[PDB]
């Protein structure tokens, strides 16, 4: 029963919004734990990337107006209102699909990716559906990662994600659910 594993490891707020996401796709949560788990991870990682990365009042990155803005984990009715308002404020074209994160320093939209195996291979299967609209961020459970050169994710945050992913990968393989 993975429903318990999710309730132990993920926080209350992560789960509620992960279900709210599946409610707008018109799908049943409790009869498909497989999908809900990834949505919680995907949702968790999207926060993690933001969390610590601040920007100071002029325009530089440090650790402690944040550097990123979180889209994933909101209602569609608002998310699109947000995304559209960001694109027209900073003066770039509005993406055709709904993005996950938005960079304030780079003024770019971001799509986060969680994979099991090769980060490089999953990267390319995003390229085929996104061309070069958004900055991709691929993280894998087994310690792989693919990122852009122009992206502004420091060694600190990359750790937070990859460590948490493997921490869940170990807790899955320990109790046989991987």
């Amino acid at each position: 029963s993975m429903d318990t594993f999710i309730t132990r490891n993920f926080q209350t707020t992560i789960i509620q919004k992960a279900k709210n996401t599946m409610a707008e796709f018109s799908e049943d949560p409790e009869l498909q734990p497989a999908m809900l788990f990834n949505i919680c991870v995907h949702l968790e990682v999207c926060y993690v990337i933001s969390d610590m990365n601040f920007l100071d009042e002029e325009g530089k990155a440090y650790t402690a107006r944040p550097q990123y803005e979180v889209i994933e984990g909101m209602p569609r009715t608002i998310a699109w209102m947000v995304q559209r308002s960001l694109a027209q404020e900073h003066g770039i074209e509005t993406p055709k699909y709904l993005a996950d994160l938005f960079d304030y320093k780079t003024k770019r939209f971001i799509e986060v990716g969680i994979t099991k195996g090769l980060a490089d291979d999953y990267f390319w299967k995003k390229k085929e559906k996104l061309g070069n609209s958004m900055e991709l961020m691929i993280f894998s459970y087994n310690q792989d990662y693919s990122l852009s050169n122009e992206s502004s994710l420091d060694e600190e945050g990359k750790g937070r994600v990859l460590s948490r992913l493997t921490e869940l990968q170990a807790e899955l393989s320990l109790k046989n659910l991987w």
Partner: protein
Amino acid sequence: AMTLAKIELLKQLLRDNEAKTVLKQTTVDQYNIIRKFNTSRIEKNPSLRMKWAMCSNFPLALTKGDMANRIPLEYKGIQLKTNAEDIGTKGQMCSIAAVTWWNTYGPIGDTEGFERVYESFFLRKMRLDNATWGRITFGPVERVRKRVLLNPLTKEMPPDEASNVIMEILFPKEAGIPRESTWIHRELIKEKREKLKGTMITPIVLAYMLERELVARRRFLPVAGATSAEFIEMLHCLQGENWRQIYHPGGNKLTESRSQSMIVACRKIIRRSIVASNPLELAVEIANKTVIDTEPLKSCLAAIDGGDVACDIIRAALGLKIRQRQRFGRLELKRISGRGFKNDEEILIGNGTIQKIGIWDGEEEFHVRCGECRGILKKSKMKLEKLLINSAKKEDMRDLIILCMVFSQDTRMFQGVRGEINFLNRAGQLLSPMYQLQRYFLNRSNDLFDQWGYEESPKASELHGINESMNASDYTLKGVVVTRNVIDDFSSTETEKVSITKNLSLIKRTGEVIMGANDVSELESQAQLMITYDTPKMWEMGTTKELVQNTYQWVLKNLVTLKAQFLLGKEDMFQWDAFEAFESIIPQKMAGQYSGFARAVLKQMRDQEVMKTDQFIKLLPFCFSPPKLRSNGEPYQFLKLVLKGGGENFIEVRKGSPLFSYNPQTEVLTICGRMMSLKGAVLAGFLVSGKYDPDLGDFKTIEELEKLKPGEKANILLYQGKPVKVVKRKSALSNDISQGIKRQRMTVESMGWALSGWSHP
């Protein structure tokens, strides 16, 4: 660095519009197609073409480069190479002499490491030089056409595994996935890495030369006697159809090394696991934590495709294929036709008892083997319609005929039973009906052959019949035939997945069973590679002295635990698993007495006195068995404690003995001739940034990790198959994530505020 030079060349290809559309349209998948693309015609008869071209002027083709230009145009009136540039490459060609000139007058190259690159070939020369050559013998040899390994390996693996090893050696960045049962050859990888470092030979070759000494080259050959690679390589010289030749190799012991140990290791895991209840659960928990030399047993059983029976049983328990074959005691069977329904029935047998047997129904055929003799079987419902065998050892020719008559379930077999047949195994359990009949007819063979009857021999040139005495005759046993023609080897190429029972029997997916626990061989031998059993239960299958070792060694390790339970004063501390094995060397007649004595002495040290460390260790192993006291109620008392074997094997209670002695002034504890002195949070720095990177060096331990500065990289080997890059800290997750949400809830509330048409600040 090369990096930038690649980009410049790529841009220079994108100038040409044809090459642009190649790289744009053609896929990474299709790379494998376009590399083989050529114009030309593949010309028949290359040997004809070679002789023709070699006689011509300029048959060779030459690669352009700085090294090509150091070859001159002429040399003493001889044309080496040609100018005539082809417009495509702007390139050149040359003649046979051009190569010969290079080997004579050309430049020196860095041929350092060449020996270590082609090591697999150089080991063949090492075998030939040091090998002593024995006597020659002219005589007819029967050559068995067996499946055999052609070339000896450094470490046997499958292609799937060896590739991911080869990758982490030569191409560590591109390797990709960090696999479980792949890295753990870190000894071999780190060894190959440093050996193949200074050389500058083409990687594609290095990979091929690694593959030659890590992948099995197994073909069928006519073989007799030895079945080991270091012999097989020389087979052309070792034997022919009508002669023989003795040979003793370089003598470093390979191939057989793991094959022999793996057999014994598995067999001995079985013998221990059979007895106690739930053999499967023990066979697993043991085999998981067993070791051969350095490799865990999992990877050995999986990689090597040999084994006997116990190997395949242990394989199945852990979870890998074994081989599509069927075994019955000593008999081997491969299904060649037919399929049967094992169907329960009540059966009367000859002696006059009702056994509940399953009856194989339906037409069937089988390729069958036993020992040195091989043959073919045909049976039906409780009837052996036909059997064939080959001229071989009479001991095994007999056993084969018997065991076929058993599994054929012929009514003539069942009627030939005389006397009771209550046979047991090692653990003291009732053998199932047919496994019982097996050992009866192997023992009492003559009772069967009389009941069987005789018929005419088949008059075909290369055949003859046999009788009770296993000799040539014009009479023959009803069904059985012998042939002059020699038969194929065992032969079982394909592999299959299998499930396992509580009693270590292997079940095929259909419902029937193929490999039973009872089918193993009793024959024992010693392990060539050094086995190590980290589990406690298997200490039993050491010797007397080495068990006293491993027990007292376990007490020294877990002193803090045992000494804490001592203060509490309960009877659970005496019932540890380690002391259950120690009872195997105490004679049964005396065990409980020693325990009653030992418990009384350790009780006395708790109540009336203070702690005495050496005696507490000395006496604790004897306390396992239930306390057998005197008739009046008080305990027995002793001076010395005798163990199995006798002579030197005894523990003195008072002070010193050979097995055990403590010197109180210097405080030195001698255990079987081994001295042992008795004098007396960081996992938060666990941020995973990348993967195994050679730049950071060797795998650093805990001590050095504390001294690293905040915000710096390092290599760590974490747990169960994880070689990963790590960074030092520089909050703790849970509070961070909630704060990220509060910033999102901020954004949301303003956008709702906006939907009505307001703002926050």
